[PDB]
Amino acid sequence: QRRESWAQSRDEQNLLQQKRIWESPLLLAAKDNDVQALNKLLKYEDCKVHQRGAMGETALHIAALYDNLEAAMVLMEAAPELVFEPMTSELYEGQTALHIAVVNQNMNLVRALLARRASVSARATGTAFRRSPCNLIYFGEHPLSFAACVNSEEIVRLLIEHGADIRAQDSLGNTVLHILILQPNKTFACQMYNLLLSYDRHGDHLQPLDLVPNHQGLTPFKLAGVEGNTVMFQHLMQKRKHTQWTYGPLTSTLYDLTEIDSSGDEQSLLELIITTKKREARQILDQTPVKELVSLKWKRYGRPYFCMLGAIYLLYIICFTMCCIYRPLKPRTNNRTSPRDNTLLQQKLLQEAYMTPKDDIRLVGELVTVIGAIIILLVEVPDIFRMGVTRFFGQTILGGPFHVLIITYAFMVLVTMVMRLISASGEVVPMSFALVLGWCNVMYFARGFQMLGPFTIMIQKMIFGDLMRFCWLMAVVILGFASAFYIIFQTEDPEELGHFYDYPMALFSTFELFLTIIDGPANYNVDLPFMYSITYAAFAIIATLLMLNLLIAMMGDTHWRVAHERDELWRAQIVATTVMLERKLPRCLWPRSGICGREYGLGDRWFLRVED
Amino acid sequence: QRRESWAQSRDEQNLLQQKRIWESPLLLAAKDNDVQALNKLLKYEDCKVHQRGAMGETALHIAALYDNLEAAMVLMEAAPELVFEPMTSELYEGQTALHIAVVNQNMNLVRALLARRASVSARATGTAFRRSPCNLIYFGEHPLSFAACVNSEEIVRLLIEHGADIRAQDSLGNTVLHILILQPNKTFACQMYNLLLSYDRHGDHLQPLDLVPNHQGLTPFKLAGVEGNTVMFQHLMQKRKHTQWTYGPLTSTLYDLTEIDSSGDEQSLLELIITTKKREARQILDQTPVKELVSLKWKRYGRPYFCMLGAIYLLYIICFTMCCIYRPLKPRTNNRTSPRDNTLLQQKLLQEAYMTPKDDIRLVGELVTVIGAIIILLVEVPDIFRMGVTRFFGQTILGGPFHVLIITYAFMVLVTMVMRLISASGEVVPMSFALVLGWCNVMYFARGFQMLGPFTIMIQKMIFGDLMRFCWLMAVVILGFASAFYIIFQTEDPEELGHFYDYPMALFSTFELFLTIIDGPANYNVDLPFMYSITYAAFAIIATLLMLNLLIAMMGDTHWRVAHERDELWRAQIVATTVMLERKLPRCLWPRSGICGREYGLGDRWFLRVED
Ligand SMILES: CCCCCCCC/C=C\CCCCCCCC(=O)O[C@@H](COC(=O)CCCCCCCCCCCCCCC)COP(=O)([O-])OCC[N+](C)(C)C
Ligand SMILES: CCCCCCCC/C=C\CCCCCCCC(=O)O[C@@H](COC(=O)CCCCCCCCCCCCCCC)COP(=O)([O-])OCC[N+](C)(C)C
Ligand SMILES: CCCCCCCC/C=C\CCCCCCCC(=O)O[C@@H](COC(=O)CCCCCCCCCCCCCCC)COP(=O)([O-])OCC[N+](C)(C)C
Ligand SMILES: CCCCCCCC/C=C\CCCCCCCC(=O)O[C@@H](COC(=O)CCCCCCCCCCCCCCC)COP(=O)([O-])OCC[N+](C)(C)C
Ligand SMILES: CCCCCCCC/C=C\CCCCCCCC(=O)O[C@@H](COC(=O)CCCCCCCCCCCCCCC)COP(=O)([O-])OCC[N+](C)(C)C
Ligand SMILES: CCCCCCCC/C=C\CCCCCCCC(=O)O[C@@H](COC(=O)CCCCCCCCCCCCCCC)COP(=O)([O-])OCC[N+](C)(C)C
Ligand SMILES: CCCCCCCC/C=C\CCCCCCCC(=O)O[C@@H](COC(=O)CCCCCCCCCCCCCCC)COP(=O)([O-])OCC[N+](C)(C)C
Ligand SMILES: CCCCCCCC/C=C\CCCCCCCC(=O)O[C@@H](COC(=O)CCCCCCCCCCCCCCC)COP(=O)([O-])OCC[N+](C)(C)C
Ligand SMILES: CCCCCCCC/C=C\CCCCCCCC(=O)O[C@@H](COC(=O)CCCCCCCCCCCCCCC)COP(=O)([O-])OCC[N+](C)(C)C
Ligand SMILES: CCCCCCCC/C=C\CCCCCCCC(=O)O[C@@H](COC(=O)CCCCCCCCCCCCCCC)COP(=O)([O-])OCC[N+](C)(C)C
Ligand SMILES: CC(C)CCC[C@@H](C)[C@H]1CC[C@H]2[C@@H]3CC=C4C[C@@H](OC(=O)CCC(=O)O)CC[C@]4(C)[C@H]3CC[C@]12C
Ligand SMILES: CC(C)CCC[C@@H](C)[C@H]1CC[C@H]2[C@@H]3CC=C4C[C@@H](OC(=O)CCC(=O)O)CC[C@]4(C)[C@H]3CC[C@]12C
Ligand SMILES: CC(C)CCC[C@@H](C)[C@H]1CC[C@H]2[C@@H]3CC=C4C[C@@H](OC(=O)CCC(=O)O)CC[C@]4(C)[C@H]3CC[C@]12C
Ligand SMILES: [Ca+2]
């Protein structure tokens, strides 16, 4: 409602702009190329040259919009004050006509305005210029930023000659080199990037203008990685690579690897690409400094430390499994209630549970599971206190779904610990969750293997893709037929056919008949009711044939899509593991990657050598 | 038989045409370019120049058919009356030779006929010129219509100079601008469309000739949408769009949206595209006025009103389900007939059914289901009285299959209402239909969701595609093997293996063995008959392996075809919903789309603004 009222207000204000032009002979003669009408209109007063349209625009703005050079020249000669006028409206605050002629690439009217001393530092701070999905252009705020984004190299040279600050930042802190990365035509933005670094002749040289961050802390090199700009990433790596020698077909290149790999506790380029929402960012992982660095970290220190943790976790779940197998049980102390009561054993009290030497061996195994579950909560839960408590930890959970599965496992172990201590009934329900969550967390360590790794991306995309959007159609066919199956057998004896004896069992039986994992109900010794055969024949056609195989056909497409991009998806699993594993392990266990300088006359930087 | 006798009569009349030419020296010398023979033949009388062929043709028609200019000139000089002669035959009534030279594009013979004052208003009303599947050309009735369709711009200019009525309509009411849309070469028809609007210089200007309807009420703009002419639709929208401004790469266009969106109670362009048989018409839904209008109606008012009705219907079916769960049942009053009688409960009488406070809570829930079923019939059934009673409501049912599923649900609720009142046995059969039709109508509201929506197009196309044409082969393999299975066990005791104990159960068991949803019959404690193992091994290979997986392979192709055109099929579901929902809800709930004029100096029209 709010996004649609903003689009409705922008449309009504654009129609009100065209109305106010037609209502006044001044702005209408600026819109058309009526030179003689602007001559005759201006002869009888100052003639309200400071007349505002619906957008806060003047007539000199209107001649700038419609590329009316001869109309705009008359207005500047009559009123030279119109050159310094911004648009006064929230949609276009601060926009002058020097902005408009730059965007329209009117070369003669840019020189005409700067001859009348037009400001090159005027900031278009209106809401039609901000970086938003509502806006189709993000050109920045300054006329040098507008000229760089329309690829007018001759205006970019002409604005810097008149004093345009090349280091100017907008509200987002973006310099002109940041804004060029955010542009759709990426080949032209490479050429404009080179032209604007050529004017950095120690101009406010605290930083060389390709090292200036925005308010997010991103330089143009890091912004090209976060936004998935692979064209600008290859172009900006040419400054960061150094050819050592060329021996025929061979070449030894030395890569800078300073802004790619984390120097201190700042987030590196690898951490930003993993933790971003754009999926074009993960094509930077296939680039010639970055692909070699990821393979180097994994083979040297990533995969040994990951297979050590996978073997410790696999021994831990085997210890948890056996203390659930040997859980303390005794024969039941009450008598059987109904003939449907199948329970023979109940669970011992806490005083009874630890009395034999086999109960003390289990107690050692049970304390390992408790201590291991506390260590999981001491490692993984303090992330929510360091990160955002709700929001920023939420992208960690959308990023890694195995975070919550080992957190939920660790809470289920501590729930059944408390039930052990207070002697509460029903420890089978915390244990059964912890058994299946404990063993299905071993599928986390499948990503140590190129072949096994993206199988869990298939399992994820079949659940939260195919299943989560087709289960709503399945649930409503189950609810329809299970309700029919319930009332058909509601008058019958359940001892012969008891699949639908109460309504929760009729729901569970129809779900199992859907998936064809129990057989169709049949007796052949009694007369089943007449509507059963018609309803189950209709169920067997729509559910077991049609809608079950429809889901299997969907998941076969999900298999095919993930197996196509299989190696690209495994490399993203490796970066996310290596980032996590380097962050949590100390620097003594993780040596820094590449070769450092300072013993080779190269600085304090850390270099990576590729021979190609 | 009737379509084939008409093709047989047209073929015999075309062979009789070539016979009558060869039988007469006049028409044979017109067919060939025998100038000296037509000279010598014409010297001995008037010489029967008014001689009719099999098609009612003259010799001047024959010289026009075979592009014989020098033969046709001799015939006009000898007989000037032959210029005014139409063909006198039902297949070619009214066709003159000015029609024939125009179609053959004989430039010299068109000028030669109009020099002899040939009629440009002659109407070819024969059955070979009407719009029919029997005819390969539909060129209209007038020579200006024939010249526009053969793309002869020089004849079109030359016929208008001699007084051709450009506003002339044929039997279908089609002007020359209507007929150009019905032509296969669409690029040439765009150029001929522009040339014929250029001659509308206030000529009978009640309407500008692109606003003249045919007898179906369609203008050329609406006819391009109904016929799926996307080339002519983009060309005719250029008159209906207005560029407000151009700001560098940006452009603001204002679209007319008058003939696209419904002004009054007339059918709009969106209603005509949904309710038409052609499926090329639904490519108009992806066009730049229409795609933005559909997304605007759905996001503002379509999807809120559709999810309100989906939540009210979902609460209604839950109320219907629980009054079927708690239906009035008592223990049976008679004794058990046979040992196959499994019935324990029967249903209470009407006097017994409402005696407790829990029966009055159900009575409130049962009256909600009755009132809701009457409202479904008061909303949906009066369409058949407003539309066609049989025919035109039939395309509504072929268009929406969820119309009949909620009508059949509403009748099943009122059948079990009457059985409740008269205390009739067997309310389980109207309830079981109403339970599965009630809950599977919740799949109607899946089309509020882009992902869930065209799942029901898959379910439809697998039933009425794959299943309805392969069930005939399955039914005959079931009937063959169930008859064999019946007579094999006809001499056996059914207490051990009773799958085929009578012939309706042998049919039902073999259907379930086909679908592999009951296990294969086996005892292992008795000797089964010898032909069972041979027949069931043959059944398991042809039916469970081969013909079951053959159907699953078909439906996997139906899945792949619908998932390919997935978003194009969901947008057609949204237009059909929005059309239905705007028609039934009052105008106070549905504001009209776009921005109106009259506060912006644009008229009383309603405009839609796209910034691109
Ligand atoms: C990939 C493979 C790798 C290896 C996997 C090995 C797989 C096989 C593993 C084991 C073999 C299978 C069971 C052997 C059979 C009986 C053994 C026994 O004496 O149990 C006794 C008690 O034992 C317990 O209560 C165990 C509960 C805690 C186990 C943890 C020990 C603590 C060590 C912490 C270590 C830290 C962990 C590391 C943390 C990082 C009782 O047994 P019972 O009553 O005589 O049973 C009758 C059986 N029957 C009916 C069949 C007759
Ligand atoms: C392991 C041994 C250690 C013992 C040491 C000390 C313990 C000693 C304590 C008591 C001794 C008494 C004997 C109890 C025996 C077993 C209890 C049982 O299951 O059945 C019992 C019911 O009791 C319950 O089931 C309680 C319900 C479970 C509550 C737990 C919620 C989990 C919340 C956290 C997870 C949130 C998950 C959400 C995630 C999304 C018995 O009732 P019954 O079986 O119904 O009898 C009828 C049988 N019939 C149905 C066949 C007719
Ligand atoms: C915050 C700590 C909890 C408070 C501690 C003291 C509790 C004081 C309460 C009762 C004390 C009186 C003793 C009588 C015996 C038990 C009777 C009883 O009331 O048990 C009840 C509690 O059972 C539970 O559900 C425990 C789980 C609750 C909180 C989870 C633990 C937090 C661990 C961190 C993880 C959090 C993350 C969760 C994510 C999964 C349920 O009863 P029952 O199950 O139906 O069995 C009946 C047993 N009887 C038949 C033998 C009689
Ligand atoms: C105690 C209980 C255990 C603990 C709690 C368990 C919580 C769950 C664990 C981890 C949850 C962590 C976040 C969800 C996973 C991320 C998915 C995602 O990226 O977004 C997804 C949507 O997003 C959703 O669907 C929202 C989740 C729905 C509700 C969560 C409960 C689901 C039940 C879970 C049980 C499932 C039933 C199976 C049998 C039981 C987008 O999908 P995608 O994956 O990015 O790509 C697929 C789309 N594609 C096909 C077009 C390509
Ligand atoms: C994707 C997943 C969706 C879930 C799928 C399935 C949901 C299942 C999940 C959980 C159900 C299991 C609950 C167990 C507790 C018992 C209570 C019970 O249900 O039975 C009770 C009955 O009461 C009813 O009949 C309520 C159901 C009516 C229909 C509402 C469906 C809810 C989903 C709507 C949304 C649909 C969403 C579809 C898209 C919009 C008691 O039954 P009884 O014992 O026989 O007693 C009868 C007494 N009698 C003999 C006098 C007659
Ligand atoms: C997506 C989810 C949304 C919500 C879905 C909620 C899902 C769950 C919904 C409900 C919970 C499931 C049942 C609860 C269990 C018993 C309740 C009870 O007292 O029933 C009593 C009578 O009740 C009836 O007869 C009901 C029949 C009419 C229902 C409609 C009410 C009228 C309101 C009109 C409203 C207008 C509707 C709107 C129209 C637009 C009898 O019960 P019992 O004999 O004691 O049963 C024994 C059970 N046992 C064997 C297990 C012991
Ligand atoms: C819900 C409670 C409310 C009650 C209130 C008032 C009601 C009180 C009224 C009577 C009380 C008497 C007790 C009756 C008990 C149930 C009746 C029954 O099913 O079986 C009965 C047969 O009776 C029939 O089935 C009649 C046949 C059905 C006709 C309906 C046609 C539907 C037409 C429209 C739909 C068109 C669909 C077409 C669409 C394409 C009993 O016979 P039996 O069971 O065979 O016994 C032998 C058992 N054996 C086979 C196991 C050997
Ligand atoms: C037009 C209204 C109908 C006339 C009203 C009065 C009818 C007068 C008739 C008998 C009155 C005598 C009373 C004795 C008790 C019943 C005996 C009997 O003959 O019942 C018969 C009628 O059962 C039906 O099939 C009813 C359905 C017929 C028309 C559908 C209703 C129209 C609703 C609009 C929707 C239309 C759309 C349809 C699309 C689905 C069948 O008998 P039974 O089922 O085998 O059960 C025997 C019961 N007994 C064992 C207890 C004895
Ligand atoms: C009380 C009973 C309930 C109420 C009455 C029920 C009446 C039915 C409900 C709605 C019917 C409304 C019209 C039919 C649906 C439209 C289909 C259509 O467009 O034409 C189709 C042919 O057309 C036919 O096949 C004619 C229908 C056959 C007879 C109808 C009974 C079918 C039984 C229904 C039970 C099915 C068995 C399943 C399990 C039981 C063309 O197919 P398509 O879809 O356009 O595209 C597929 C072709 N493609 C794959 C090449 C792309
Ligand atoms: C796509 C859907 C097609 C449907 C497929 C399935 C159709 C089935 C649908 C409905 C059948 C169920 C009816 C129930 C009523 C009982 C009557 C009955 O059938 O059994 C009776 C037998 O009589 C027969 O044997 C008739 C069948 C002979 C073959 C004709 C097949 C019809 C389809 C032809 C067109 C094929 C189309 C294929 C393509 C051209 C009684 O049997 P009994 O009780 O054992 O008594 C025997 C007494 N004895 C012991 C003395 C020996
Ligand atoms: C008494 C002692 C011997 C118990 C031993 C316990 C270990 C088996 C536990 C302790 C901490 C656990 C770790 C805590 C946190 C993590 C991070 C976790 O990361 C993710 O799941 C990322 C999610 C994703 O990217 O999808 C993977 C499991 C792991 C290594 C755990 C593996 C199992 C560990 C080593
Ligand atoms: C006792 C019963 C009732 C417990 C039910 C258990 C389920 C809730 C568990 C068991 C298996 C689990 C799944 C096992 C594997 C995966 C893949 C995993 O996918 C990834 O994270 C892959 C992405 C990547 O590797 O980068 C996401 C969680 C998911 C779907 C799990 C979700 C939770 C599931 C369905
Ligand atoms: C006592 C009261 C509270 C009962 C409430 C009854 C409602 C749940 C009913 C009344 C009228 C029904 C509507 C009547 C007609 C239609 C049109 C119908 O349109 C189609 O099915 C189009 C078919 C297709 O395009 O495939 C969809 C269901 C709907 C909205 C129905 C939805 C359910 C409604 C709102
Ligand atoms: Ca089985």
mmCIF file of C-alpha atoms in Angstrom, chain A residues 179-313:
data_model
loop_
_atom_site.group_PDB
_atom_site.id
_atom_site.type_symbol
_atom_site.label_atom_id
_atom_site.label_comp_id
_atom_site.label_asym_id
_atom_site.label_seq_id
_atom_site.Cartn_x
_atom_site.Cartn_y
_atom_site.Cartn_z
ATOM 1 C CA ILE A 179 28.921 4.814 -8.757
ATOM 2 C CA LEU A 180 30.447 3.542 -12.024
ATOM 3 C CA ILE A 181 30.452 0.011 -10.619
ATOM 4 C CA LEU A 182 26.708 0.277 -9.960
ATOM 5 C CA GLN A 183 25.994 0.946 -13.667
ATOM 6 C CA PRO A 184 24.411 -1.524 -16.119
ATOM 7 C CA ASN A 185 26.763 -0.982 -19.081
ATOM 8 C CA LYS A 186 29.921 -2.385 -17.579
ATOM 9 C CA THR A 187 32.261 -2.095 -20.564
ATOM 10 C CA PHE A 188 31.761 1.675 -20.775
ATOM 11 C CA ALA A 189 32.235 1.951 -17.011
ATOM 12 C CA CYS A 190 35.693 0.383 -17.286
ATOM 13 C CA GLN A 191 36.785 3.117 -19.701
ATOM 14 C CA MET A 192 35.322 5.852 -17.513
ATOM 15 C CA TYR A 193 37.075 4.320 -14.496
ATOM 16 C CA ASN A 194 40.467 4.692 -16.197
ATOM 17 C CA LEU A 195 39.726 8.273 -17.239
ATOM 18 C CA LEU A 196 38.863 9.342 -13.686
ATOM 19 C CA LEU A 197 41.917 7.773 -12.065
ATOM 20 C CA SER A 198 44.050 9.737 -14.524
ATOM 21 C CA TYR A 199 42.980 12.969 -12.780
ATOM 22 C CA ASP A 200 44.177 11.842 -9.322
ATOM 23 C CA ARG A 201 47.358 13.944 -9.349
ATOM 24 C CA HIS A 202 47.936 13.933 -5.566
ATOM 25 C CA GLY A 203 44.568 15.636 -5.160
ATOM 26 C CA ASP A 204 43.824 15.341 -1.416
ATOM 27 C CA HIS A 205 46.124 12.331 -1.367
ATOM 28 C CA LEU A 206 45.349 10.780 1.956
ATOM 29 C CA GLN A 207 43.997 7.913 -0.180
ATOM 30 C CA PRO A 208 44.392 7.350 -3.942
ATOM 31 C CA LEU A 209 40.555 7.581 -4.592
ATOM 32 C CA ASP A 210 40.350 3.883 -5.382
ATOM 33 C CA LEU A 211 40.987 3.239 -1.673
ATOM 34 C CA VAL A 212 38.356 5.686 -0.373
ATOM 35 C CA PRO A 213 35.490 3.822 1.331
ATOM 36 C CA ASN A 214 31.807 4.653 1.321
ATOM 37 C CA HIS A 215 29.675 4.612 4.480
ATOM 38 C CA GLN A 216 29.560 0.815 4.280
ATOM 39 C CA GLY A 217 33.366 0.767 4.346
ATOM 40 C CA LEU A 218 33.664 -0.517 0.783
ATOM 41 C CA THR A 219 36.311 0.650 -1.651
ATOM 42 C CA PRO A 220 35.546 0.371 -5.392
ATOM 43 C CA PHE A 221 37.445 -2.934 -5.441
ATOM 44 C CA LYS A 222 35.347 -4.439 -2.653
ATOM 45 C CA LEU A 223 32.149 -2.966 -4.108
ATOM 46 C CA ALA A 224 32.800 -4.741 -7.410
ATOM 47 C CA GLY A 225 32.943 -8.025 -5.509
ATOM 48 C CA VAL A 226 29.827 -7.439 -3.399
ATOM 49 C CA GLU A 227 27.758 -6.333 -6.402
ATOM 50 C CA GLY A 228 28.934 -9.188 -8.615
ATOM 51 C CA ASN A 229 30.575 -6.903 -11.163
ATOM 52 C CA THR A 230 32.934 -9.429 -12.713
ATOM 53 C CA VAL A 231 33.851 -7.090 -15.571
ATOM 54 C CA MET A 232 35.038 -4.386 -13.177
ATOM 55 C CA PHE A 233 36.653 -7.007 -10.940
ATOM 56 C CA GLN A 234 38.941 -8.253 -13.720
ATOM 57 C CA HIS A 235 39.710 -4.667 -14.705
ATOM 58 C CA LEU A 236 40.591 -3.610 -11.165
ATOM 59 C CA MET A 237 42.806 -6.672 -10.624
ATOM 60 C CA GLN A 238 45.129 -5.472 -13.401
ATOM 61 C CA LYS A 239 46.441 -2.833 -10.987
ATOM 62 C CA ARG A 240 46.957 -5.541 -8.350
ATOM 63 C CA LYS A 241 48.909 -8.077 -10.437
ATOM 64 C CA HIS A 242 52.606 -7.959 -11.326
ATOM 65 C CA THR A 243 54.201 -10.071 -14.051
ATOM 66 C CA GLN A 244 57.537 -11.417 -12.830
ATOM 67 C CA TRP A 245 58.740 -13.025 -16.070
ATOM 68 C CA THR A 246 57.608 -14.507 -19.362
ATOM 69 C CA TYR A 247 59.398 -17.667 -20.500
ATOM 70 C CA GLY A 248 57.905 -18.465 -23.875
ATOM 71 C CA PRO A 249 54.352 -19.627 -23.271
ATOM 72 C CA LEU A 250 54.830 -19.387 -19.505
ATOM 73 C CA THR A 251 54.118 -16.338 -17.361
ATOM 74 C CA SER A 252 54.636 -15.848 -13.627
ATOM 75 C CA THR A 253 52.204 -13.309 -12.179
ATOM 76 C CA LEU A 254 52.311 -12.067 -8.586
ATOM 77 C CA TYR A 255 48.940 -11.007 -7.150
ATOM 78 C CA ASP A 256 48.517 -8.360 -4.459
ATOM 79 C CA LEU A 257 46.059 -10.345 -2.287
ATOM 80 C CA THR A 258 45.856 -7.543 0.290
ATOM 81 C CA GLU A 259 42.248 -6.466 -0.079
ATOM 82 C CA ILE A 260 41.131 -9.984 -1.040
ATOM 83 C CA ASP A 261 42.461 -11.734 2.079
ATOM 84 C CA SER A 262 41.750 -10.443 5.589
ATOM 85 C CA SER A 263 44.590 -8.432 7.103
ATOM 86 C CA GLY A 264 43.112 -7.883 10.562
ATOM 87 C CA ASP A 265 39.653 -8.274 12.072
ATOM 88 C CA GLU A 266 38.049 -6.365 9.183
ATOM 89 C CA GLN A 267 35.792 -8.316 6.845
ATOM 90 C CA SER A 268 37.663 -9.476 3.755
ATOM 91 C CA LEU A 269 36.411 -9.796 0.211
ATOM 92 C CA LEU A 270 35.733 -13.508 0.746
ATOM 93 C CA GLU A 271 33.578 -12.799 3.800
ATOM 94 C CA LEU A 272 31.563 -10.137 1.975
ATOM 95 C CA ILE A 273 30.786 -12.307 -1.054
ATOM 96 C CA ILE A 274 29.496 -15.176 1.093
ATOM 97 C CA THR A 275 27.406 -12.959 3.376
ATOM 98 C CA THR A 276 25.679 -10.961 0.622
ATOM 99 C CA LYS A 277 22.229 -11.396 -0.903
ATOM 100 C CA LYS A 278 23.320 -11.119 -4.532
ATOM 101 C CA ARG A 279 24.182 -14.385 -6.244
ATOM 102 C CA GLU A 280 26.157 -12.717 -9.018
ATOM 103 C CA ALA A 281 28.769 -12.020 -6.331
ATOM 104 C CA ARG A 282 29.668 -15.712 -6.269
ATOM 105 C CA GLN A 283 31.094 -15.489 -9.787
ATOM 106 C CA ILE A 284 34.057 -13.623 -8.260
ATOM 107 C CA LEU A 285 34.972 -17.016 -6.734
ATOM 108 C CA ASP A 286 36.007 -18.232 -10.208
ATOM 109 C CA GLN A 287 38.545 -15.434 -10.817
ATOM 110 C CA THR A 288 42.297 -15.890 -11.137
ATOM 111 C CA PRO A 289 43.428 -14.446 -7.757
ATOM 112 C CA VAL A 290 40.423 -15.735 -5.845
ATOM 113 C CA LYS A 291 40.001 -19.260 -7.235
ATOM 114 C CA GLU A 292 43.638 -20.085 -6.472
ATOM 115 C CA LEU A 293 43.399 -18.603 -2.970
ATOM 116 C CA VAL A 294 40.315 -20.617 -2.003
ATOM 117 C CA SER A 295 41.830 -23.871 -3.267
ATOM 118 C CA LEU A 296 45.020 -23.039 -1.378
ATOM 119 C CA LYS A 297 43.297 -22.429 1.968
ATOM 120 C CA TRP A 298 41.172 -25.554 1.682
ATOM 121 C CA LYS A 299 43.872 -28.026 0.671
ATOM 122 C CA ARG A 300 46.444 -26.782 3.169
ATOM 123 C CA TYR A 301 44.465 -26.045 6.308
ATOM 124 C CA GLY A 302 40.747 -26.079 5.565
ATOM 125 C CA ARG A 303 40.165 -29.747 4.733
ATOM 126 C CA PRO A 304 42.453 -31.189 7.488
ATOM 127 C CA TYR A 305 40.742 -29.129 10.205
ATOM 128 C CA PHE A 306 37.307 -29.870 8.756
ATOM 129 C CA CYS A 307 37.844 -33.635 8.679
ATOM 130 C CA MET A 308 39.147 -33.554 12.246
ATOM 131 C CA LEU A 309 35.937 -31.864 13.396
ATOM 132 C CA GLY A 310 33.875 -34.276 11.332
ATOM 133 C CA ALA A 311 35.504 -37.286 12.956
ATOM 134 C CA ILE A 312 35.143 -35.842 16.459
ATOM 135 C CA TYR A 313 31.471 -35.122 15.785
#
